[PDB]
Amino acid sequence: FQGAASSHKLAEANTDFAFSLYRELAKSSPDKNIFFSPVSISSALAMLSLGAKGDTHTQILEGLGFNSEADIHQGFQHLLQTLNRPKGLQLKTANGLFVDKSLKLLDSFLEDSKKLYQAEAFSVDFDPEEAKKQINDWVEKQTNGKIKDLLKDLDSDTVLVLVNAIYFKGKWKKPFDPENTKEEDFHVDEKTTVKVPMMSQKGKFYYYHDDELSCKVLELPYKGNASMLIILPDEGGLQHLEQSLTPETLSKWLKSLTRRSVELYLPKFKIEGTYDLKEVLSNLGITDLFSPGADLSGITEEKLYVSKAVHKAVLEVNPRSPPEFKADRPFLFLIRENKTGSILFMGKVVNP
């Protein structure tokens, strides 16, 4: 008789899911830019769990970091409402489910997926031509034309397509002066150098030098009650830092940050990540959902499974003897929402 999970349970589960997801991507695609929204992915899977049953359902909840018998829908609704409050970042998310029109959808799923997660389901004919354009145009519309041509290919024994895209360009609480921006070398690796517009700013920032993990941590507050936590590893050993990237480590960092005079150098960069959720969540124990035989009877009585699941996230960033924070080599970052502590984005900039 497990009642609705607490907000604190959701915070723990999503954050564990966030870091385990990064850890997988960092080993899947090394030496590559990483950028994704863990909370967005958690929400999409939680939404699908509305129509999931049996082992299909169990794998999702446990994969998300919850008990098998947990009730997560009340908590997620409240979380999403809080994240999408007017004083927040006002993230525009393309959150849609596309299923074969020949399949009758349960109105309970349609109601709950929209009411609890603001997800929109659609019945479409899945011929590769018209279907791809229809979905891509919708995603483009939902993201104010920022994310175009999301789907590149599409089989046509395709019965169910999950789409989840988000573009983010926030405003700093303390902006960079363009007169202090200067072109500098960004050292991608030992043999590769990229010229970047290096923004600079001298002032008070919450900052911490991690002796143990050999990295610098700095907090950059956004307008909208969120902040970017930038993690700059010392020379070499970015891999060792990634191995230590845990909810525990994050918590230690947040307690260790002190407001200090810092000389900050941050490059202007635009990065993105595009992920096949089938292959990524495969290593997270969520397998049945993406294969035929899945139990999605809560969505439709006809047999159904997720044919394709795509997540894409795009990010644009544009006394006495103070510490220097110069990000002219690959670095990690998180975007954390202040009120809930929710991890909105995780990323790594290798190629700016």
Tokens 């929209």: give the residue.
114
9 and 111 fall within a common domain: yes
166 and 99 fall within a common domain: yes
| 3-class secondary-structure state, position 28 | helix
- Contact yes or no for 43/118 (Cβ under 8 A): no
> Rounded to an integer, what distance in angstroms lies between the CA atom of residue 290 and that of residue 279?
9
135 and 262 fall within a common domain: no
Write out the residue range of the structural domain in which residue 343 sits. Answer: 173-267+319-352
Tokens 């990634």: give the residue.
242
Whether cis (ω within 30° of 0) applies to the bond prior to 320 is: yes
Residue 88 belongs to a domain with what CATH number?
3.30.497.10
How many domains would you assign to the chain?
2
190 and 328 fall within a common domain: yes
247 and 323 fall within a common domain: yes
343 and 224 fall within a common domain: yes
Indicate which technique resolved this structure.
X-ray
User: Interior CA angle at 344 toward 338 and 348, to 5°?
Assistant: 115
**Helices then strands, each counted (H, E), the chain:** 9, 14
Phi–psi pair at 120, nearest 5 degrees = -115, 120
99 and 232 fall within a common domain: no
Both tokens assigned to 347: 């990323």
Sign of CA dihedral 23, 165, 100, 45: positive
Sign of CA dihedral 324, 329, 335, 341: negative
> Rounded to an integer, what distance in angstroms lies between the CA atom of residue 141 and that of residue 117?
19
